[PDB]
Amino acid sequence: MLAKRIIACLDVKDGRVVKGTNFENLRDSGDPVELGKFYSEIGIDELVFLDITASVEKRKTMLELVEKVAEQIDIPFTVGGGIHDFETASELILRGADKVSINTAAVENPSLITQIAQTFGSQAVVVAIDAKRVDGEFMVFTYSGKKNTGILLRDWVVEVEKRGAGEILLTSIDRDGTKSGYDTEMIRFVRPLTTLPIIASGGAGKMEHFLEAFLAGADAALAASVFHFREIDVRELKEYLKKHGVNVRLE
Amino acid sequence: MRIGIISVGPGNIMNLYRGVKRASENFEDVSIELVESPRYDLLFIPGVHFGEGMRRLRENDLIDFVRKHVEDERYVVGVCLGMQLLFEESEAPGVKGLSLIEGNVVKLRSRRLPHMGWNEVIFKDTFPNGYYAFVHTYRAVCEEEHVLGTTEYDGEIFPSAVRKGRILGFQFHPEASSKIGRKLLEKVIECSL
Protein backbone atom coordinates (compact mmCIF):
# COMPACT_ATOMS: atom_id res chain seq x y z
CA MET A 1 0.00 0.00 0.00
CA LEU A 2 1.33 3.42 -1.01
CA ALA A 3 3.02 4.89 2.06
CA LYS A 4 2.29 8.39 3.33
CA ARG A 5 5.49 10.36 2.79
CA ILE A 6 7.77 12.32 5.08
CA ILE A 7 9.49 14.93 2.91
CA ALA A 8 12.52 17.03 3.81
CA CYS A 9 12.82 20.49 2.32
CA LEU A 10 16.35 21.77 1.74
CA ASP A 11 16.41 25.54 1.21
CA VAL A 12 19.53 26.21 -0.85
CA LYS A 13 21.23 29.46 -1.90
CA ASP A 14 24.10 29.53 -4.41
CA GLY A 15 24.60 25.87 -3.56
CA ARG A 16 24.44 25.96 0.24
CA VAL A 17 21.84 25.07 2.89
CA VAL A 18 20.53 28.16 4.66
CA LYS A 19 21.04 28.57 8.42
CA GLY A 20 23.14 25.41 8.36
CA THR A 21 22.31 22.27 10.27
CA ASN A 22 22.80 20.73 13.76
CA PHE A 23 24.11 17.55 12.22
CA GLU A 24 27.65 17.90 13.56
CA ASN A 25 27.93 14.15 12.84
CA LEU A 26 28.25 15.18 9.20
CA ARG A 27 31.35 16.92 7.90
CA ASP A 28 29.34 19.99 6.89
CA SER A 29 26.42 21.85 8.44
CA GLY A 30 25.08 23.15 5.15
CA ASP A 31 26.18 20.95 2.26
CA PRO A 32 22.87 20.23 0.44
CA VAL A 33 24.19 17.02 -1.14
CA GLU A 34 25.66 15.57 2.03
CA LEU A 35 22.58 16.54 4.01
CA GLY A 36 20.39 14.92 1.32
CA LYS A 37 22.60 11.85 1.28
CA PHE A 38 22.19 11.80 5.04
CA TYR A 39 18.41 12.31 5.04
CA SER A 40 18.14 9.18 2.89
CA GLU A 41 20.34 7.29 5.35
CA ILE A 42 18.03 8.24 8.22
CA GLY A 43 14.70 7.57 6.53
CA ILE A 44 13.40 10.61 4.65
CA ASP A 45 11.13 9.43 1.83
CA GLU A 46 11.78 12.32 -0.57
CA LEU A 47 13.78 15.51 -0.93
CA VAL A 48 12.76 18.98 -2.08
CA PHE A 49 15.43 21.53 -2.98
CA LEU A 50 14.30 25.17 -3.07
CA ASP A 51 16.81 27.55 -4.64
CA ILE A 52 16.92 31.30 -4.03
CA THR A 53 20.11 32.22 -5.89
CA ALA A 54 20.05 35.75 -7.31
CA SER A 55 19.14 34.97 -10.92
CA VAL A 56 22.50 36.27 -12.17
CA GLU A 57 23.88 32.86 -11.26
CA LYS A 58 20.62 31.02 -10.46
CA ARG A 59 20.24 29.14 -13.76
CA LYS A 60 23.79 27.77 -13.70
CA THR A 61 23.66 27.23 -9.93
CA MET A 62 20.55 25.02 -9.95
CA LEU A 63 21.93 22.82 -12.72
CA GLU A 64 25.09 22.59 -10.64
CA LEU A 65 23.01 21.51 -7.64
CA VAL A 66 20.95 18.98 -9.62
CA GLU A 67 23.96 17.32 -11.22
CA LYS A 68 25.76 16.92 -7.88
CA VAL A 69 22.60 15.68 -6.13
CA ALA A 70 21.50 13.09 -8.72
CA GLU A 71 25.02 11.69 -8.63
CA GLN A 72 24.81 10.86 -4.93
CA ILE A 73 21.28 10.59 -3.49
CA ASP A 74 19.26 7.37 -3.75
CA ILE A 75 15.78 8.73 -3.09
CA PRO A 76 13.46 10.75 -5.35
CA PHE A 77 14.08 14.50 -5.31
CA THR A 78 12.48 17.70 -6.58
CA VAL A 79 13.95 21.05 -7.66
CA GLY A 80 12.03 24.30 -7.60
CA GLY A 81 12.44 28.04 -7.20
CA GLY A 82 12.34 30.37 -10.17
CA ILE A 83 11.76 27.78 -12.87
CA HIS A 84 10.06 30.05 -15.38
CA ASP A 85 9.85 28.17 -18.70
CA PHE A 86 9.85 24.74 -20.35
CA GLU A 87 13.46 25.40 -21.28
CA THR A 88 14.64 25.77 -17.66
CA ALA A 89 12.61 22.76 -16.54
CA SER A 90 13.65 20.49 -19.41
CA GLU A 91 17.38 20.98 -18.76
CA LEU A 92 16.86 20.50 -15.02
CA ILE A 93 14.97 17.22 -15.42
CA LEU A 94 17.55 16.07 -17.95
CA ARG A 95 20.34 16.97 -15.51
CA GLY A 96 18.95 14.36 -13.10
CA ALA A 97 15.98 15.85 -11.25
CA ASP A 98 13.06 13.46 -10.77
CA LYS A 99 10.58 16.35 -10.62
CA VAL A 100 10.44 20.13 -10.91
CA SER A 101 8.27 22.50 -8.90
CA ILE A 102 6.57 25.37 -10.71
CA ASN A 103 4.49 28.09 -9.08
CA THR A 104 4.44 31.73 -10.20
CA ALA A 105 5.34 30.66 -13.74
CA ALA A 106 2.45 28.18 -13.72
CA VAL A 107 -0.20 30.60 -12.49
CA GLU A 108 0.93 33.05 -15.18
CA ASN A 109 1.17 30.41 -17.89
CA PRO A 110 -0.90 27.31 -17.06
CA SER A 111 -0.09 25.76 -20.45
CA LEU A 112 3.39 25.27 -18.95
CA ILE A 113 2.04 22.52 -16.71
CA THR A 114 0.89 20.65 -19.82
CA GLN A 115 4.06 21.46 -21.77
CA ILE A 116 6.23 19.63 -19.27
CA ALA A 117 3.69 16.87 -18.67
CA GLN A 118 3.59 15.90 -22.34
CA THR A 119 7.37 15.80 -22.76
CA PHE A 120 8.36 14.34 -19.38
CA GLY A 121 5.03 12.91 -18.18
CA SER A 122 2.68 14.15 -15.44
CA GLN A 123 4.89 12.36 -12.91
CA ALA A 124 7.59 15.02 -13.39
CA VAL A 125 5.35 18.02 -12.69
CA VAL A 126 4.76 19.41 -9.20
CA VAL A 127 2.75 22.61 -8.88
CA ALA A 128 3.43 24.59 -5.72
CA ILE A 129 0.42 26.52 -4.43
CA ASP A 130 0.96 29.17 -1.76
CA ALA A 131 -2.41 30.11 -0.26
CA LYS A 132 -3.63 32.61 2.31
CA ARG A 133 -7.01 33.75 3.65
CA VAL A 134 -8.15 37.10 2.28
CA ASP A 135 -11.62 38.15 3.45
CA GLY A 136 -12.82 34.67 4.40
CA GLU A 137 -11.78 33.03 1.14
CA PHE A 138 -8.71 30.97 0.23
CA MET A 139 -6.78 32.97 -2.36
CA VAL A 140 -3.75 31.95 -4.41
CA PHE A 141 -0.60 34.05 -4.01
CA THR A 142 2.28 34.24 -6.50
CA TYR A 143 5.75 35.81 -6.29
CA SER A 144 6.76 34.03 -3.07
CA GLY A 145 3.50 34.88 -1.28
CA LYS A 146 3.61 38.62 -2.03
CA LYS A 147 1.19 39.07 -4.95
CA ASN A 148 -2.49 38.21 -4.55
CA THR A 149 -3.63 36.75 -7.88
CA GLY A 150 -7.39 37.11 -7.39
CA ILE A 151 -7.56 33.41 -8.25
CA LEU A 152 -9.58 31.38 -5.76
CA LEU A 153 -7.76 28.30 -4.49
CA ARG A 154 -10.84 26.16 -5.19
CA ASP A 155 -10.49 27.01 -8.89
CA TRP A 156 -6.71 26.87 -9.25
CA VAL A 157 -6.57 23.38 -7.72
CA VAL A 158 -9.06 21.96 -10.23
CA GLU A 159 -7.31 23.79 -13.07
CA VAL A 160 -3.86 22.49 -12.12
CA GLU A 161 -5.23 18.93 -12.30
CA LYS A 162 -6.95 19.52 -15.64
CA ARG A 163 -3.70 21.06 -16.90
CA GLY A 164 -1.91 17.76 -16.36
CA ALA A 165 -0.04 18.33 -13.10
CA GLY A 166 1.00 15.22 -11.19
CA GLU A 167 1.21 16.53 -7.64
CA ILE A 168 0.40 19.59 -5.52
CA LEU A 169 2.67 21.15 -2.90
CA LEU A 170 0.29 23.10 -0.67
CA THR A 171 1.84 25.74 1.60
CA SER A 172 -0.25 27.73 4.04
CA ILE A 173 1.29 31.19 4.17
CA ASP A 174 -0.64 31.66 7.42
CA ARG A 175 1.34 28.86 9.09
CA ASP A 176 4.69 28.78 7.28
CA GLY A 177 7.51 28.98 9.81
CA THR A 178 5.35 28.93 12.93
CA LYS A 179 5.95 25.45 14.36
CA SER A 180 2.28 25.58 15.46
CA GLY A 181 0.88 22.84 13.24
CA TYR A 182 -0.04 22.45 9.58
CA ASP A 183 -3.06 24.26 8.22
CA THR A 184 -5.36 21.26 8.42
CA GLU A 185 -8.42 23.33 7.58
CA MET A 186 -6.82 24.19 4.23
CA ILE A 187 -5.81 20.58 3.59
CA ARG A 188 -9.36 19.39 4.33
CA PHE A 189 -10.66 22.15 2.07
CA VAL A 190 -8.54 21.01 -0.87
CA ARG A 191 -8.79 17.26 -0.32
CA PRO A 192 -12.23 16.92 -1.97
CA LEU A 193 -11.45 19.18 -4.93
CA THR A 194 -8.76 16.93 -6.39
CA THR A 195 -7.54 13.33 -6.51
CA LEU A 196 -3.95 14.51 -6.95
CA PRO A 197 -1.38 13.78 -4.23
CA ILE A 198 -1.21 16.61 -1.69
CA ILE A 199 1.96 17.62 0.17
CA ALA A 200 1.30 19.57 3.35
CA SER A 201 3.79 22.38 3.94
CA GLY A 202 4.17 25.09 6.55
CA GLY A 203 3.56 24.95 10.27
CA ALA A 204 5.35 21.74 11.21
CA GLY A 205 6.63 21.93 14.78
CA LYS A 206 6.30 18.39 16.07
CA MET A 207 5.28 14.78 15.56
CA GLU A 208 1.57 15.19 16.16
CA HIS A 209 1.29 17.93 13.55
CA PHE A 210 2.21 15.24 11.04
CA LEU A 211 -0.63 12.95 12.18
CA GLU A 212 -3.08 15.87 12.03
CA ALA A 213 -1.99 16.60 8.45
CA PHE A 214 -2.59 13.01 7.37
CA LEU A 215 -6.00 12.98 9.04
CA ALA A 216 -6.75 16.17 7.12
CA GLY A 217 -6.13 14.21 3.93
CA ALA A 218 -2.51 14.96 3.03
CA ASP A 219 -0.55 12.31 1.12
CA ALA A 220 2.78 13.75 2.24
CA ALA A 221 4.08 16.14 4.90
CA LEU A 222 7.00 18.47 4.25
CA ALA A 223 9.26 20.19 6.76
CA ALA A 224 12.66 21.84 7.15
CA SER A 225 13.94 23.55 10.31
CA VAL A 226 12.41 20.87 12.54
CA PHE A 227 14.56 18.27 10.77
CA HIS A 228 17.73 20.32 10.19
CA PHE A 229 17.83 21.37 13.86
CA ARG A 230 17.36 17.81 15.17
CA GLU A 231 13.98 18.91 16.59
CA ILE A 232 12.31 15.66 15.41
CA ASP A 233 13.89 12.27 14.75
CA VAL A 234 12.71 10.66 11.52
CA ARG A 235 12.58 7.03 12.68
CA GLU A 236 10.75 8.10 15.85
CA LEU A 237 8.25 10.16 13.87
CA LYS A 238 7.49 7.15 11.67
CA GLU A 239 7.27 4.74 14.61
CA TYR A 240 4.80 7.20 16.13
CA LEU A 241 2.67 7.52 12.98
CA LYS A 242 2.59 3.77 12.44
CA LYS A 243 1.44 3.32 16.04
CA HIS A 244 -1.50 5.61 15.31
CA GLY A 245 -2.64 3.88 12.14
CA VAL A 246 -0.82 5.86 9.46
CA ASN A 247 0.81 3.80 6.74
CA VAL A 248 4.41 4.96 6.69
CA ARG A 249 7.49 3.37 5.16
CA LEU A 250 9.28 1.54 7.99
CA GLU A 251 12.51 -0.32 7.34
CA MET B 1 32.53 -10.23 -12.43
CA ARG B 2 31.51 -8.41 -15.61
CA ILE B 3 28.35 -6.33 -15.23
CA GLY B 4 26.60 -4.87 -18.24
CA ILE B 5 23.90 -2.23 -18.19
CA ILE B 6 22.07 -1.70 -21.48
CA SER B 7 22.37 2.05 -22.00
CA VAL B 8 20.21 2.62 -25.08
CA GLY B 9 17.09 3.74 -23.34
CA PRO B 10 14.61 5.05 -23.12
CA GLY B 11 14.65 6.94 -19.83
CA ASN B 12 17.44 7.95 -17.51
CA ILE B 13 19.67 4.88 -17.15
CA MET B 14 22.60 6.56 -15.37
CA ASN B 15 20.85 6.67 -12.00
CA LEU B 16 20.97 2.88 -12.32
CA TYR B 17 24.65 2.85 -13.31
CA ARG B 18 25.36 4.91 -10.18
CA GLY B 19 23.24 2.66 -7.99
CA VAL B 20 24.99 -0.44 -9.32
CA LYS B 21 28.48 1.09 -8.99
CA ARG B 22 27.39 2.01 -5.46
CA ALA B 23 26.34 -1.55 -4.59
CA SER B 24 29.43 -3.13 -6.18
CA GLU B 25 31.83 -1.17 -3.92
CA ASN B 26 32.50 -3.87 -1.32
CA PHE B 27 32.97 -6.44 -4.08
CA GLU B 28 36.28 -7.68 -5.51
CA ASP B 29 37.39 -7.34 -9.16
CA VAL B 30 34.18 -5.68 -10.40
CA SER B 31 33.53 -4.01 -13.78
CA ILE B 32 30.50 -2.11 -15.10
CA GLU B 33 29.95 -1.22 -18.73
CA LEU B 34 27.25 0.72 -20.50
CA VAL B 35 26.01 -1.66 -23.17
CA GLU B 36 24.86 -1.28 -26.80
CA SER B 37 26.36 -4.35 -28.61
CA PRO B 38 28.05 -7.88 -28.04
CA ARG B 39 30.88 -8.70 -25.47
CA TYR B 40 28.56 -10.32 -19.24
CA ASP B 41 27.92 -12.25 -15.98
CA LEU B 42 25.09 -9.96 -14.88
CA LEU B 43 23.13 -8.16 -17.60
CA PHE B 44 20.77 -5.30 -16.77
CA ILE B 45 17.83 -4.30 -18.95
CA PRO B 46 16.67 -0.84 -17.72
CA GLY B 47 14.17 1.65 -19.09
CA VAL B 48 11.42 4.19 -18.51
CA HIS B 49 6.59 3.16 -23.77
CA PHE B 50 6.81 -0.59 -24.45
CA GLY B 51 7.18 0.32 -28.15
CA GLU B 52 10.34 2.39 -27.75
CA GLY B 53 13.14 0.36 -26.21
CA MET B 54 11.68 -2.75 -27.77
CA ARG B 55 12.59 -0.88 -30.92
CA ARG B 56 15.93 0.26 -29.48
CA LEU B 57 16.92 -3.33 -28.61
CA ARG B 58 16.21 -4.27 -32.23
CA GLU B 59 18.00 -1.25 -33.69
CA ASN B 60 21.12 -2.32 -31.78
CA ASP B 61 21.21 -6.08 -32.42
CA LEU B 62 20.77 -6.82 -28.73
CA ILE B 63 17.77 -9.15 -28.84
CA ASP B 64 20.27 -11.89 -29.61
CA PHE B 65 22.82 -10.50 -27.16
CA VAL B 66 20.24 -11.02 -24.40
CA ARG B 67 18.98 -14.32 -25.79
CA LYS B 68 22.56 -15.62 -25.62
CA HIS B 69 22.81 -14.54 -21.99
CA VAL B 70 19.69 -16.38 -20.84
CA GLU B 71 20.75 -19.39 -22.91
CA ASP B 72 24.14 -19.45 -21.16
CA GLU B 73 22.76 -19.50 -17.60
CA ARG B 74 23.92 -15.87 -17.21
CA TYR B 75 21.90 -13.50 -15.02
CA VAL B 76 19.49 -11.23 -16.87
CA VAL B 77 17.68 -8.58 -14.84
CA GLY B 78 14.91 -6.33 -16.14
CA VAL B 79 14.30 -3.06 -14.28
CA CYS B 80 11.11 -1.02 -14.70
CA LEU B 81 10.17 -1.03 -18.40
CA GLY B 82 12.95 -3.57 -18.77
CA MET B 83 10.87 -5.99 -16.70
CA GLN B 84 7.80 -5.61 -18.90
CA LEU B 85 10.00 -6.34 -21.94
CA LEU B 86 10.79 -9.81 -20.58
CA PHE B 87 7.24 -10.75 -21.52
CA GLU B 88 5.35 -11.58 -24.72
CA GLU B 89 3.36 -8.40 -25.29
CA SER B 90 2.08 -5.25 -23.60
CA GLU B 91 -0.94 -3.08 -24.10
CA ALA B 92 1.75 -1.25 -27.12
CA PRO B 93 -0.96 -2.91 -29.15
CA GLY B 94 0.73 -5.32 -31.52
CA VAL B 95 4.40 -5.39 -30.48
CA LYS B 96 6.07 -8.65 -29.47
CA GLY B 97 8.26 -8.58 -26.37
CA LEU B 98 11.32 -10.66 -25.52
CA SER B 99 9.08 -13.59 -24.56
CA LEU B 100 11.73 -14.71 -22.06
CA ILE B 101 9.04 -15.25 -19.45
CA GLU B 102 5.52 -16.29 -20.45
CA GLY B 103 2.95 -13.57 -19.83
CA ASN B 104 1.82 -10.12 -20.89
CA VAL B 105 1.51 -6.52 -19.69
CA VAL B 106 -1.68 -4.73 -18.73
CA LYS B 107 -2.94 -1.32 -17.54
CA LEU B 108 -3.49 -1.12 -13.77
CA ARG B 109 -7.08 -1.40 -12.53
CA SER B 110 -6.82 1.93 -10.73
CA ARG B 111 -8.57 5.24 -11.38
CA ARG B 112 -5.43 6.83 -9.91
CA LEU B 113 -2.45 6.49 -12.28
CA PRO B 114 0.44 6.29 -12.44
CA HIS B 115 1.19 4.17 -9.41
CA MET B 116 3.67 6.57 -7.86
CA GLY B 117 5.55 6.60 -4.56
CA TRP B 118 6.86 4.11 -2.03
CA ASN B 119 4.94 0.84 -1.95
CA GLU B 120 5.61 -2.41 -0.09
CA VAL B 121 7.14 -5.37 -1.90
CA ILE B 122 6.79 -8.79 -0.30
CA PHE B 123 9.22 -11.41 -1.65
CA LYS B 124 8.75 -15.17 -1.81
CA ASP B 125 12.40 -15.43 -0.87
CA THR B 126 15.95 -14.05 -1.05
CA PHE B 127 15.25 -10.33 -1.37
CA PRO B 128 14.46 -7.78 1.37
CA ASN B 129 10.80 -7.21 2.10
CA GLY B 130 10.15 -3.49 2.46
CA TYR B 131 9.19 -0.29 0.68
CA TYR B 132 10.58 0.48 -2.78
CA ALA B 133 10.01 3.47 -5.07
CA PHE B 134 7.46 2.87 -7.86
CA VAL B 135 6.46 4.90 -10.94
CA HIS B 136 4.48 2.93 -13.53
CA THR B 137 1.13 2.57 -15.28
CA TYR B 138 1.38 -0.97 -16.64
CA ARG B 139 1.77 -4.25 -14.73
CA ALA B 140 2.88 -7.77 -15.59
CA VAL B 141 0.51 -10.72 -15.83
CA CYS B 142 2.13 -14.13 -15.31
CA GLU B 143 2.03 -17.50 -13.58
CA GLU B 144 2.54 -17.74 -9.81
CA GLU B 145 5.49 -19.88 -10.88
CA HIS B 146 7.26 -16.70 -12.02
CA VAL B 147 6.07 -14.35 -9.27
CA LEU B 148 8.93 -13.29 -6.98
CA GLY B 149 7.61 -10.21 -5.22
CA THR B 150 4.10 -8.91 -4.59
CA THR B 151 2.66 -5.41 -4.15
CA GLU B 152 -0.84 -3.99 -3.59
CA TYR B 153 -1.97 -0.70 -5.14
CA ASP B 154 -5.58 0.40 -4.73
CA GLY B 155 -6.78 -3.08 -3.83
CA GLU B 156 -4.93 -4.63 -6.77
CA ILE B 157 -2.23 -7.22 -6.08
CA PHE B 158 0.37 -7.63 -8.80
CA PRO B 159 3.92 -8.93 -9.47
CA SER B 160 6.22 -6.12 -8.37
CA ALA B 161 8.98 -8.68 -8.90
CA VAL B 162 9.36 -11.63 -11.26
CA ARG B 163 11.69 -14.60 -11.84
CA LYS B 164 12.19 -17.40 -14.39
CA GLY B 165 15.38 -19.18 -13.32
CA ARG B 166 18.26 -16.73 -13.68
CA ILE B 167 16.05 -14.15 -15.37
CA LEU B 168 14.89 -11.48 -12.91
CA GLY B 169 12.45 -8.59 -13.10
CA PHE B 170 11.83 -5.66 -10.74
CA GLN B 171 9.01 -3.14 -11.30
CA PHE B 172 10.37 -0.48 -8.91
CA HIS B 173 13.47 1.72 -8.85
CA PRO B 174 16.13 0.15 -6.60
CA GLU B 175 18.43 3.07 -7.38
CA ALA B 176 15.82 5.37 -5.82
CA SER B 177 14.89 3.07 -2.94
CA SER B 178 17.39 4.28 -0.31
CA LYS B 179 19.23 1.74 1.86
CA ILE B 180 16.95 -1.16 0.92
CA GLY B 181 17.44 -0.67 -2.80
CA ARG B 182 21.20 -0.82 -2.27
CA LYS B 183 20.71 -4.01 -0.26
CA LEU B 184 18.47 -5.38 -3.05
CA LEU B 185 21.10 -4.62 -5.67
CA GLU B 186 23.83 -6.14 -3.48
CA LYS B 187 21.75 -9.33 -3.25
CA VAL B 188 21.35 -9.37 -7.03
CA ILE B 189 25.13 -9.20 -7.40
CA GLU B 190 25.64 -11.82 -4.66
CA CYS B 191 23.28 -14.09 -6.62
CA SER B 192 25.25 -13.94 -9.89
CA LEU B 193 28.01 -15.87 -8.11
mmCIF file of C-alpha atoms in Angstrom, chain A residues 1-3 5 40-42 45-46 70-76 96 98-99 123 161 166 195-197 242 247-250, chain B residues 12 15 18 22 48 112 114-120 130-135 151-153 174-180 182:
data_model
loop_
_atom_site.group_PDB
_atom_site.id
_atom_site.type_symbol
_atom_site.label_atom_id
_atom_site.label_comp_id
_atom_site.label_asym_id
_atom_site.label_seq_id
_atom_site.Cartn_x
_atom_site.Cartn_y
_atom_site.Cartn_z
ATOM 1 C CA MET A 1 0.000 0.000 0.000
ATOM 2 C CA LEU A 2 1.328 3.419 -1.014
ATOM 3 C CA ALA A 3 3.022 4.892 2.062
ATOM 4 C CA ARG A 5 5.487 10.359 2.790
ATOM 5 C CA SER A 40 18.135 9.183 2.885
ATOM 6 C CA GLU A 41 20.344 7.286 5.350
ATOM 7 C CA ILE A 42 18.032 8.239 8.218
ATOM 8 C CA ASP A 45 11.126 9.428 1.831
ATOM 9 C CA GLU A 46 11.778 12.316 -0.567
ATOM 10 C CA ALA A 70 21.497 13.092 -8.725
ATOM 11 C CA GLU A 71 25.018 11.695 -8.633
ATOM 12 C CA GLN A 72 24.807 10.855 -4.930
ATOM 13 C CA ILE A 73 21.275 10.589 -3.488
ATOM 14 C CA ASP A 74 19.261 7.373 -3.755
ATOM 15 C CA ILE A 75 15.781 8.727 -3.089
ATOM 16 C CA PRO A 76 13.460 10.750 -5.351
ATOM 17 C CA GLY A 96 18.953 14.364 -13.101
ATOM 18 C CA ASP A 98 13.063 13.458 -10.768
ATOM 19 C CA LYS A 99 10.575 16.347 -10.624
ATOM 20 C CA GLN A 123 4.893 12.356 -12.910
ATOM 21 C CA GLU A 161 -5.227 18.926 -12.302
ATOM 22 C CA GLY A 166 0.998 15.222 -11.186
ATOM 23 C CA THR A 195 -7.537 13.330 -6.505
ATOM 24 C CA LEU A 196 -3.950 14.512 -6.952
ATOM 25 C CA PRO A 197 -1.377 13.781 -4.230
ATOM 26 C CA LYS A 242 2.593 3.771 12.443
ATOM 27 C CA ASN A 247 0.815 3.797 6.739
ATOM 28 C CA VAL A 248 4.407 4.957 6.686
ATOM 29 C CA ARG A 249 7.491 3.368 5.159
ATOM 30 C CA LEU A 250 9.280 1.544 7.990
ATOM 31 C CA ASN B 12 17.438 7.950 -17.508
ATOM 32 C CA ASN B 15 20.848 6.669 -11.996
ATOM 33 C CA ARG B 18 25.356 4.911 -10.181
ATOM 34 C CA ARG B 22 27.395 2.008 -5.456
ATOM 35 C CA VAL B 48 11.416 4.190 -18.510
ATOM 36 C CA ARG B 112 -5.432 6.825 -9.912
ATOM 37 C CA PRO B 114 0.437 6.286 -12.444
ATOM 38 C CA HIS B 115 1.187 4.167 -9.413
ATOM 39 C CA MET B 116 3.674 6.575 -7.861
ATOM 40 C CA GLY B 117 5.546 6.605 -4.558
ATOM 41 C CA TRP B 118 6.860 4.108 -2.027
ATOM 42 C CA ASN B 119 4.940 0.842 -1.950
ATOM 43 C CA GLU B 120 5.612 -2.411 -0.092
ATOM 44 C CA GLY B 130 10.148 -3.493 2.463
ATOM 45 C CA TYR B 131 9.192 -0.292 0.682
ATOM 46 C CA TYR B 132 10.577 0.480 -2.776
ATOM 47 C CA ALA B 133 10.009 3.467 -5.074
ATOM 48 C CA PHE B 134 7.457 2.867 -7.861
ATOM 49 C CA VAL B 135 6.460 4.898 -10.936
ATOM 50 C CA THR B 151 2.661 -5.414 -4.150
ATOM 51 C CA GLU B 152 -0.842 -3.986 -3.595
ATOM 52 C CA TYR B 153 -1.970 -0.705 -5.142
ATOM 53 C CA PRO B 174 16.129 0.147 -6.598
ATOM 54 C CA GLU B 175 18.432 3.074 -7.382
ATOM 55 C CA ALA B 176 15.824 5.368 -5.823
ATOM 56 C CA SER B 177 14.894 3.069 -2.938
ATOM 57 C CA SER B 178 17.392 4.279 -0.311
ATOM 58 C CA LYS B 179 19.235 1.736 1.865
ATOM 59 C CA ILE B 180 16.951 -1.156 0.925
ATOM 60 C CA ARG B 182 21.197 -0.818 -2.273
#
